[PDB]
Design a protein around this ligand. Structure first.
Ligand SMILES: C[C@H](N)C(=O)N[C@H](CCC(=O)N[C@@H](CCCCNC(=O)CNC(=O)CNC(=O)CNC(=O)CNC(=O)CN)C(=O)N[C@H](C)C(=O)O)C(N)=O
Length: 93
């Protein structure tokens, strides 16, 4: 199913690979666009995530970056009122 954290983020464990088809802004700290930008995952650059979150109008995946800091990558839009998902911005493998 899902779990809900202190901050009303829906989350659960899920290990797989995401290759974006477009440049996506990654965040530090948590799955919100108001969070500091960690950087940009470029089109075709595969990452291996261990977490999935629904929050701030998006489905995010969370992984551990190259400084042991968690990185939050948005992969598609999510309306919580309808639980509707936009096109995935890449392929899960
Ligand atoms: C229970 C119910 N849902 C509820 O009403 N909760 C509120 C939360 C209020 C709160 O915490 N505010 C923050 C500032 C938030 C605005 C600022 N927003 C944030 O900081 C957001 N923070 C994060 O997202 C943290 N990162 C993650 O979580 C990453 N993990 C996941 O996303 C999912 N995975 C997991 O969770 C794994 N276990 C605040 O006051 N901060 C003060 C200083 C402090 O702590 O004293 C409440 N009244 O308690």
């Amino acid at each position: 199913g899902w779990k809900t954290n202190k901050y009303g983020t829906l989350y659960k464990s899920e290990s797989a690979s995401f290759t974006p088809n477009t440049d996506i802004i990654t965040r530090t700290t948590g799955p919100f666009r108001s969070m500091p930008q960690s950087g940009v995952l470029k089109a075709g650059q595969t990452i291996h995530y261990d977490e999935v979150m629904k929050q701030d109008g998006h489905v995010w995946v969370g992984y551990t970056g190259n400084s042991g800091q968690r990185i939050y990558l948005p992969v598609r839009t999510w309306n919580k009122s309808t639980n509707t998902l936009g096109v995935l911005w890449g392929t899960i493998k």
